[PDB]
């Protein structure tokens, strides 16, 4: 029985129920994420920005089933084109807008990665991706508004691949946390 999360804490409690088992009902998880109405006071603790690039701020470890993190995107900050390491990725906007650009997996042949589509993800909207769907890039293209997003990865992963848009070549990247549970983690 899916109920509207009243607060971020309530959302987290609900997520623990939805990930209690070994599989993932993607549509239910996405629906509850989209039903949480972003309340900045509830997530201010995690919203730690860096001047030069986007930051990853761990919120909850999902009893081992998922990582829930808040990403803070300064103006013009964006990601690589990347995969999600055989995990589910849910991305909910908490503040601002993000451009999501979709790419297919490259062939072995070195070639330009041509975008398959793009969309603007707006406040409170929740997107979903996995490796079976493809790759994406996420960017805050705003010149005037920082963006904040809530990401759920299941299972948790700490590495992924970045893809060179010019060639399709991939490189392994280890993700780092800017903070965990509100505590800056150099
Ligand atoms: Fe992603």
Domains and CATH numbers, the chain: 1-186 (2.60.120.10)
- Beta strands 81-82; 159-163: pairing state: antiparallel
Q: Is 137 exposed, middle or buried (0-12, 13-18, 19+ CB in 10 A)?
A: buried
Resolution in A: 1.2
**What is the three-state SS of the chain?**
CCCCCCCHHHHHHHHHHHCCCCCCCHHHHHHHHHHCCCCHHHHHHHCCCCCCCCEEEEEECHHHCCEEEEEEECCCCECCEECCCCCEEEEEEEECCEEEEEECCCCCCCCCCCCCEEEEECCCCEEEECCCCCEEEEECCCCCCCEEEEEEEECCCCEEEEECCCCCCEEEEECCCCEECCEECC
For residues 126 and 172, the answer to whether their CB atoms sit within 8 Å is no
Closest CA to 90 of 110, 67, 109: 67
From the CA of 25, how far away is ligand 1's center (Å)? 19
Closest CA to 128 of 180, 87, 174, 172: 87
From the CA of 137, how far away is ligand 1's center (Å)? 7
Residue positions in the annotated binding site for Fe cation?
82, 84, 136
Distance CA 129, CA 70 (A): 17
CA 109 to chain centre: 29
From the CA of 152, how far away is ligand 1's center (Å)? 10
From the CA of 4, how far away is ligand 1's center (Å)? 25
Q: How was this structure determined?
A: X-ray
Token pair of 14 as six digits: 């609900």
Token pair of 17 as six digits: 């129920």
Is the torsion defined by CA of 176, 82, 131, 29 positive or negative? positive
Distance CA 166, CA 8 (A): 40
Distance CA 79, CA 107 (A): 22
Burial 105-114 (b: 16+ CB within 10 A, else e): ebeeeeeebe
Q: Which residues neighbour 139 within 8 Å (Cβ) at sequence distance 6 or greater?
A: 73, 77, 78, 79, 98, 99, 101
From the CA of 167, how far away is ligand 1's center (Å)? 19
Token pair of 164 as six digits: 């060179």
Q: Which residues neighbour 50 within 8 Å (Cβ) at sequence distance 6 or greater?
A: 72, 74, 178
């Amino acid at each position: 029985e899916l109920l509207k999360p009243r607060t971020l804490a309530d959302l987290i409690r609900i997520l623990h129920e939805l990930f209690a088992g070994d599989e993932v009902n993607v549509e239910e998880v996405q629906a509850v994420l989209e039903a949480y109405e972003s309340n900045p006071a509830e997530w201010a603790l995690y919203a730690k920005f860096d001047q030069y690039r986007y930051t990853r701020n761990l919120v909850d470890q999902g009893n081992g089933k998922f990582n829930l993190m808040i990403l803070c995107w300064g103006e013009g900050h964006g990601s690589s084109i990347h995969d999600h390491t055989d995990s589910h990725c849910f991305l909910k906007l908490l503040q601002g807008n993000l451009k999501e650009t979709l790419f297919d997996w490259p062939d072995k042949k070195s070639n330009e990665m041509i975008k398959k589509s793009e969309r603007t993800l707006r406040e409170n909207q929740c997107a979903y991706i996995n490796d079976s769907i493809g790759l994406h890039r996420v960017e805050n293209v705003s010149h005037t508004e920082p963006a904040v997003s809530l990401h759920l990865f299941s299972p948790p992963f700490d590495t992924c691949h970045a893809f060179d848009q010019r060639t399709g070549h991939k490189n392994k990247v280890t993700m780092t946390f800017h903070s965990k549970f509100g505590i800056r983690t150099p």
